[PDB]
Each structure stands twice: as structure tokens, then as C-alpha cells.
Subunit: 305 residues, 3 copies
């Protein structure tokens, strides 16, 4: 509530009061999900994509201890340039970055929280956190899934990469009552891959259906979010053997180097990019754009209802 | 909630207005838990069982996109005849069946949600969903358990069959703060069987004690449901070895055949029925009636206090 | 507005809350099931006095004759101590039944957090929290304490937990559920008898003041749930690493061999470790409790200030 705690930029506030569609964006993908310059370049361009769809982007982050909804170009570039030097902020991290007046890059979890505080129901990203490979033994399970269990926001992603255990993730989502919606797909998108061995909970072929389902869900009091898994355009999909070989190697190296906890995902994405000579990153960028277009349509349709 | 979203039948409305005890019933048991004709026959008979006990049944389902509390005989017959062609609806499914104007059969989870929307505190079923065998590696855990964790409804069941991992299920219920009440039993009733190797969290010998505990729990702000595990009547209990052999075989076949997700429980129950020559189904019917009788008493004692 | 039949706050605690004086909650399972008599009672009363010396008001919580009591008389503390295992161990799933049945009960970290929250007390000192058990990846044995920390707004000051638990899995679980794990002046998670474990808290904070500010921001931002503050035992009282880990490993092996499960696990393990260390582990436990009460008092002061 307090302006000391939370600030929405004039553009976003205008859109909100005047009821234009707003699409939220996270910052961990910037600071920890991609290298500089590509991170900031992509963040700025995803905002522009949203605007060209006739919606209003709101990139969320913690700036100087303030939860910020909508960011300046300079702030986005700050997060990008600072990179790993900025705190990665999940639900358990959030109060401390705010209290200490520091900068932080918000994960899907923290971005969902802040968007919900701002009354934004639609959030685009590249991929969600989830159940990690070996989590049956390690218990390494993203707080993103608990946020999806509880917070009312639709998250548009490409599913997630096979760095995660996608099967266990689909089971987990069912247990916690979270819809996993395939956009024009029955198969659950694998991020770099358009398909995977696993299926979504329901296939929906239009943004309008998704928006209507959101309305029914929250009107009926079923709190929690919705995952929309949107397959990467075929043109930008990684070759399967290449990408799965790269992922399997990165996971092995992560194990050997003792990479654990919040350091896992940043480490893995960076290493896969390295092993594919940048191709995986270019794919990530395209899937982010695609997700922002779909998210724009969902937000439009939702505002209309 | 909009009339379009949620409709409570006049009988149930009057019952709630007039402070008469009401017992919710689910619909997944009808469409996916039992074959036709037995499915609709049982659903109608369980309603009558509740009325004979002096309570008012409310069967819950989604009909033409509307969440319905209390159903016509024709709607129940529909759910029974259509069977698997009706969508099985858990928490993650509910919004879409409603939005798309379709019919759906609600699981313990969805039925709890809807019952709670209507102010109904007592729900009779056959067996609850739970932790599946192998869940330590598959993560297959019923959304029913999360609903029990969070939604204010007492669910009367026979425990659950050993198609599930009952040990893991008892641990899960404890972690999530959910009472597992044995009605006149310390051993946890294993559906077809009156006992199992596992324990309920507390034994209570009267519906009155159960109702008192419900009132205290919710007046203390401890949100979430309660499981009442009620052993199948002695006449209908199945001999351990035959039934467990059938269950173990059905589980092994489901694993070999790659049966997963929401298809698992229906597959397992149908197969155990096939392997037992229909006996397991006859027992399932009887434990459902028994649960409706007890649930009727719990509802009566609960309404007495509230 | 909870009924006085269910919940009673002692006049001293009521006055403290009304006068904005810092209050520090204390649990009772540690008394009945966590320590032997007389040591359990003596420690409970002494820790109250510690808190008084630090300028705060202690509130020990328990269920007495069916009433959730916030603040306890010396006699009630002595009763719980003397009765020991005859007093019911009360977690979230137990709570409604001991209250409804008018019985005595000793409240775990989970129940104590619940009642503290009902009273509006934000700071709770204890010895160690429940958590993920060794083998929980197979057994699913995970303390309801962790779900209470996920959801209920109370800071719990502890020594971490002993290696009877799986501390690694516990740190993962806390992350998934959004619960801050604060090391007090330490990055490494304290292991109860041990100052340091081969694990890292989520954040190190060096002062009560920082902790209180974080509490304020967390709850004003609407992130409901608790915070764990893991405070290393003073060096003077720490147990020798090899001796204590040998004792713990033996106790765990014996518990598994004897089929000790569920709510009986932790009390059995702590008792056995105390036996195997000839009482030294208990003396350590007592000292870490006192240390935690001191830090908790400072956090309570700073919180009330803010
Ligand atoms: O392909 C990606 N997946 C996930 C992330 C980020 O990592 C977070 C998950 O991290 P963890 O589960 O450690 O909290 C996501 O919410 C998102 O911010 C990312 O940058 N790129
Ligand atoms: O003996 C039975 N157990 C469970 C069911 C149904 O199956 C649901 C659990 O399915 P799932 O875990 O797949 O959501 C229960 O809530 C109930 O509706 C049933 O029909 N028969
Ligand atoms: O060193 C200890 N750890 C934990 C306990 C008690 O055990 C409870 C956890 O037991 P369970 O997980 O079985 O609910 C804690 O909340 C606390 O009351 C204790 O006495 N001593
Ligand atoms: Mn993780
Ligand atoms: Mn399942
Ligand atoms: Mn346990």
C-alpha cells in the first residue's frame, strides 16, 4: 500500500485507471536469465512489442528498495548491466531487498506478487520455474509453483526447458489446482522445443477462451494463477539432439560443480547458451517475444470482459 | 456469486434457510467411479438414504456450465449414462467446464469447493483421493489433499482403497494440518477392508464429538477440512487376500500400461471390479450408503450446535 | 473475536499487548515431550525469567482444560512438566480435539504459532523447529511446522534444528514455501547442538533491528507467512561434533529399526540422544533455549518500536 513500498509508473497508472490492457514482465530474466547486452535489448524490445500489440507493458523490479511497476529504459539497462550483481528475488527474498533499500530482479514468483498488488492479471515471461531434475531426492522445487498455486495472475511462458523435470512439474501443478493451458497445443511445450513427452491440462485455441476462463475462475473464488504454455515458433526452435545434449551436459556440470539453490537456473541457462554458441539464447529471445504477443491478446480480451 | 455460475436447488435452498441438516454428494463417483447402470442407481439410492435419516441430500455437479447444488433425477441419470464422456472435474479443471457451458462430474476437491460456496459443511463420498503408490518418485498426489488442507468441509469416506499409498497419505494429511478422524476405529479403514497397517490421527466414537470438533476448529480460525474415515459394514467387508491381490495386479497393470494422471483412479477401480467379478463394486456401493448415514448424523449434530 | 471458552489471554499479557510492551511467546511441547522432568519445568520457568530480565513479557502457550491459554501460571507449567507424555502433543491437526474435549495439551511450534497469531504476538522463542525428516524423500515425514511457517505471521527464533532432521531438504522446503531463513550473524545454518552446518541460510542479518524492519515490510506488503531466525548456540555450550553426530545417527538408526514413526519420532530421538550423551545434549538444549529467548526479546522490542 505505502508509496514508500510500492510505486507504479505514470504510464501504467494511466492504463490502469483508464482500463487499457496491461501486460507485466519480470526482471530476473534480465539480470539472471540472459547476458548483457542481449538482456536489456530484449527487455526493451519486448516492451515495444507489447505496445505495438495495443497493450501497455509493465516491467517489474525492485529499484532502490521500492517495488516498481513499470521501469525506465535506464533502470532496465541497469539491471541488465549489473547482471548477477543484482539480487535475485523470490518470495523469501523480497522483504529484505525492500527493507534494505536495494535493487533486485524479481522472479516469476515475486513478479506475480507485485503485479497482483498492482491489479495486473496478465504476465508474460520466457519460462517458469518448476520441479528440478532429481527433485524427488533433492526437494529442489521452484517457489514459482507455490505462487501459481495461490496468486491470481496468468503467466504466459514457453513451458520450461528440460533443465526441469517437466513430468513432475505437471503433476505438481495438478496437485495444487493450477490450470496448465496449452495454446493451440495438447503437448506441453519444452521451451527450446515445441513439444515434449508430456501433455497440458487443457488445450485452448484462442485468447478469448483463456480470458473467459480467468473470469470464471476468479469469480468463483478459486484463487491462484494460470499457466499458459505457448510453443516457440517453429522457425526458432532448437534442433532436438543439440539442445538436449547441451542441457544434459549443463545439468551434469552443475551437479559436479555443486551448483545448488537459486544459483541453479542462471548457471544452467548460461552454460547451455555457451554450449550452443548462443543459439539457445536467440531461441529464448524469440519465445519471449511470441509470449508477449499472446499475452497482449489475452490481456485485451480480459479487459473487454 | 452469479446465478449463472451457481444454482442451488429449491429443496436445498429451503433446507439451508430452515436450518435443516444437509449432506453434499459428489459426481465423479457417478461418471468415473462406477459403471452404468449401478452408478446412477447408487447416486439416487444414496440421496434416498440421506432423506430417510432425516437430512437433505445435495448432489453436486456442473450442468451446462452451471455449478449445481442439488440435482434432478434426470441429471443424475445423464451423468450415469454419459459416464466417461462427461469431464472429470478437479480444481484445475473447474473454470473451463463452467466457461465452456459443459457438463462435468466433480471430484471430492471440486465438490468441497462448491459445497463451501453454498454453506454446506458435511459431504459424504466413497473414498477420497490421496497419495498414489510410487508418488515418492512420480509426484502423483490428489488435489483432494490440498482441498482438504484449505477448504472448510468434513468429508465422510471409508478411508481410501489400497490402490493408493495410505501410509504416505497419512503423513501428508499431518503435514497439511488435516484431521483424520476414525469413526469408532483407530486403524485407518482401507475402503474394501475395515482396517489397515496405518492409524487415523484421532478416534472418535460419536457424530456429536465430530460436530463439536468441527465447530471448535472453524471458530478457532483453523481453516481446512476434516476427513472422517468410516469402516465398511462387516457384512460387506472383503477378505484381505482376494481384494489385495486384485488391487496389486491392477496397480501393476496400470504401471505397465502407462496409465497416468486423472485416468488412473477410474482405471484402477474398473479393473479391480473386473478382477473381483463385480464384488468390489458391490462393496463400494455399500460403504457409500454407510457413509451417507454417518454423514447425515454428523450434519444433524453440527446443525444442532450451529 | 474468539470465544473465551476457546482462548484466554492472561491479564499480564493482555496488559502488555494493550500497552505496546514487547511480548515473546513460548511453546509447551518442548516441556512435555522435549525434555525430562524436572529439567523441562525448571527450564520453562527460567526462560520466562530470562525474557523478563531483557525487559519483555513472556507468554507461554498451552491448552489447559480445553482452553488455548496465552500466558500460563507457574502451576500450569509444573503440571505440563510433571505429566510429560501423559499430556497430548498438539500440532495443527490435533488442536481442535484437545480444545473440544476439554483436555490439557502441549503445543508444538505449529500450534504455538497459531495461538500466538490469534493473540497478536509476532515473536516466538523456542529451541528448535520441526522440519523435513531423514528419509522424508521416501516416507513423506515432514513437520506441520513448515506449513505453519509458510502461512502464519510469526517470527520463530531457534537454534535451527538438530541433525535428527534432514537440514538440506528443510532449506529447500522453506525456499519453495517462501519462508525466510535468517541466520543471525551467520551465513551457515546452525545445527542446534552445532554452531555451523554445511548449509547456508537464505539471508544473514546481524541485528534484531534489521530483523524487525524486515518483518514490518514483509507483512505490510501482504506476504503472509512466518520467518525462521536461526541463532547459533553459544560456543561454550556447543556439543563436540563427532560425539553428537554419532549419538544422533545411532538414535535415528534405532528409531527406524523399532518402527518409531509419526508424532512419536522427535520425542524418542531427543530422549535417546540425551541418554547416549549422558545428558550433555539436554544441557546444550537448555542453554540454546535461553540464548534464543534473549535474541527473541530484542527482536520483540525492536518490532514494537517500529
Ligand atoms: O528460462 C528461464 N527460466 C526461469 C528464469 C527465472 O528463474 C526463476 C526461477 O528461479 P528459482 O526457481 O530458483 O526461484 C523464474 O521465475 C524466472 O525469473 C529465467 O530467467 N529463464
Ligand atoms: O473410490 C473412489 N475414490 C475416488 C474416486 C474419485 O476420484 C477422485 C480423485 O481423483 P484424482 O486424484 O485423480 O483427482 C475423488 O475425489 C473421487 O471423486 C472415486 O470415484 N472412487
Ligand atoms: O529440539 C526440539 N525440536 C522440536 C521439538 C518439538 O517437536 C515439534 C515438531 O514435532 P512434529 O514435527 O512431529 O510435529 C516442534 O514444533 C517442537 O514442539 C522439541 O521439543 N525439541
Ligand atoms: Mn530451487
Ligand atoms: Mn493424480
Ligand atoms: Mn512427522
Amino acid at each position: 500500500i505505502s508509496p514508500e513500498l510500492l510505486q507504479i509508473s505514470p504510464e501504467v497508472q494511466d492504463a490502469l485507471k483508464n482500463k487499457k490492457p496491461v501486460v507485466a514482465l519480470e526482471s530476473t530474466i534480465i539480470s539472471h536469465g540472459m547476458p548483457f547486452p542481449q538482456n536489456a535489448q530484449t527487455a526493451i524490445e519486448v516492451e515495444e512489442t507489447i505496445r505495438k500489440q495495443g497493450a501497455v507493458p509493465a516491467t517489474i523490479a525492485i529499484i532502490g528498495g521500492v517495488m516498481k511497476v513499470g521501469l525506465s529504459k535506464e533502470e532496465i539497462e541497469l539491471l541488465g548491466r549489473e547482471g548477477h550483481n543484482v539480487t535475485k528475488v523470490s518470495r523469501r527474498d523480497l522483504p529484505f531487498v525492500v527493507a534494505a533499500g536495494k535493487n533486485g530482479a524479481t522472479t516469476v514468483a515475486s513478479t506475480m506478487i507485485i503485479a497482483a498488488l498492482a491489479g495486473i492479471k496478465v504476465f508474460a515471461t520466457g519460462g517458469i520455474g518448476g520441479v528440478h531434475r532429481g527433485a524427488e531426492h533433492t526437494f529442489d522445487i521452484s517457489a514459482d509453483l507455490q505462487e501459481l498455486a495461490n496468486t491470481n495472475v496468468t503467466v504466459v511462458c514457453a513451458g520450461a526447458a528440460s533443465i526441469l523435470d517437466l513430468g513432475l512439474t505437471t503433476e505438481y501443478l495438478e496437485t495444487f489446482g493450477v490450470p496448465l493451458i496449452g495454446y493451440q497445443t495438447k503437448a506441453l511445450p519444452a521451451f527450446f522445443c515445441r513439444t515434449s513427452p508430456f501433455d497440458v491440462s487443457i488445450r485452448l485455441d484462442s485468447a478469448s477462451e483463456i480470458a473467459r476462463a480467468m473470469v470464471v475462475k476468479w469469480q468463483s473464488g478459486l484463487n491462484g494463477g494460470l499457466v499458459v504454455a505457448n510453443p516457440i515458433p517453429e522457425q526458432f526452435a532448437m534442433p532436438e539432439h543439440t539442445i538436449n545434449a547441451a542441457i544434459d551436459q549443463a545439468v551434469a556440470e552443475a551437479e559436479a560443480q555443486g551448483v545448488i539453490g537459486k544459483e541453479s537456473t542462471p548457471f544452467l541457462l548460461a552454460r547451455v547458451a555457451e554450449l550452443t554458441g548462443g543459439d539457445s539464447l536467440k531461441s529464448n529471445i524469440q519465445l519471449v517475444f511470441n509470449n508477449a504477443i499472446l499475452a497482449s491478446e489475452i490481456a485485451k480480451e480480459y479487459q473487454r470482459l
